[PDB]
Design an enzyme around this catalytic site. Structure first.
Site, PDB file in Angstrom:
ATOM      1  N   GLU A  37      -6.872  -5.796  -6.267  1.00 35.77           N
ATOM      2  CA  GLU A  37      -6.996  -6.024  -7.686  1.00 35.77           C
ATOM      3  C   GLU A  37      -8.517  -6.382  -7.983  1.00 35.77           C
ATOM      4  OE1 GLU A  37      -5.319  -5.861 -10.213  1.00 35.77           O
ATOM      5  OE2 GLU A  37      -5.860  -7.445 -11.633  1.00 35.77           O
ATOM      6  N   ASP A  80      -1.921  -5.710  -5.282  1.00 34.46           N
ATOM      7  CA  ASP A  80      -3.002  -6.678  -5.640  1.00 34.46           C
ATOM      8  C   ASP A  80      -3.783  -7.170  -4.447  1.00 34.46           C
ATOM      9  OD1 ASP A  80      -2.389  -6.533  -8.459  1.00 34.46           O
ATOM     10  OD2 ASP A  80      -0.674  -7.879  -8.200  1.00 34.46           O
ATOM     11  N   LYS A 130       9.956  -5.353 -11.766  1.00 37.57           N
ATOM     12  CA  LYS A 130       8.952  -4.914 -10.749  1.00 37.57           C
ATOM     13  C   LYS A 130       9.687  -4.370  -9.461  1.00 37.57           C
ATOM     14  CE  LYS A 130       4.898  -7.166 -10.435  1.00 37.57           C
ATOM     15  NZ  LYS A 130       4.119  -5.977 -10.860  1.00 37.57           N
TER      16      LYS A 130
HETATM   17 MN    MN Z   1       0.317  -7.608  -9.990  1.00 36.96          MN
END
Ligand code: MN
Length: 179
Positions: free
Chosen positions: A64, A92, A118
């Site tokens: 990320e 991430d 998710k």
């Molecule tokens: Mn995330």
């Protein structure tokens, strides 16, 4: 010129704001218009960086905050050198201790709901999921929370402080409602 825009610029550090602006432009979004999203992206950036600070020194590769192409390039280096499965969506971090990708999520709703959403979306069985809310809760794949409690507690405290700062400005209901 929204209050939210100016709030974000005084709430987050300049490096986070700049990465969030870049991220949004990359997908053709406007931080002056989609201001709740700008706030959300900054928040997600900061938490991911706080999270990476919780390891021993070489625990995590940070995905990320890279440029999208570089981010996929590094994911690919990791897949290619560890044999781990390539994710369909950008994670991430990568955890070199536990050998898994992590996707950190931040939600203004009950954690299990965003977890579930998710989980179904990544469909990467392998990618670890760790969700934080703005009410102090967390939820992680296999109840395995990766860091020690202190590293997670300070993230929870920071999210609650962002919530307060927003509420004191009358921006909270609308950020919460826009998720
Ligand atoms: Mn995330």
């Amino acid at each position: 010129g929204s209050h939210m825009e100016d709030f974000v610029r005084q709430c987050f550090n300049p490096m986070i704001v700049e990465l969030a602006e870049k991220a949004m432009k990359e997908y053709g979004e406007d931080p002056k218009i989609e201001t709740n999203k700008f706030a959300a992206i900054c928040t997600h950036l900061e938490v991911c960086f706080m999270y990476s600070d919780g390891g021993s020194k070489h625990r995590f590769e940070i995905i990320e905050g890279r440029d999208r192409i570089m981010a996929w390039t590094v994911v690919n280096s990791i897949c290619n050198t560890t044999g781990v499965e390539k994710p369909k969506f950008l994670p991430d971090l990568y955890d070199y201790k536990e050998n898994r990708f992590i996707d950190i999520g931040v939600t203004r709703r009950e954690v299990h709901i965003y977890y579930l959403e998710k989980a179904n979306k990544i469909k990467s069985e392998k990618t670890h999921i760790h969700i934080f809310s703005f009410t102090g809760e967390e939820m992680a794949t296999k109840a395995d929370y990766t860091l020690d409690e202190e590293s997670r507690a300070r993230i929870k405290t920071r999210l609650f402080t962002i919530r307060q700062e927003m509420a004191s400005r009358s921006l909270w209901d609308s950020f919460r409602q826009s998720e």
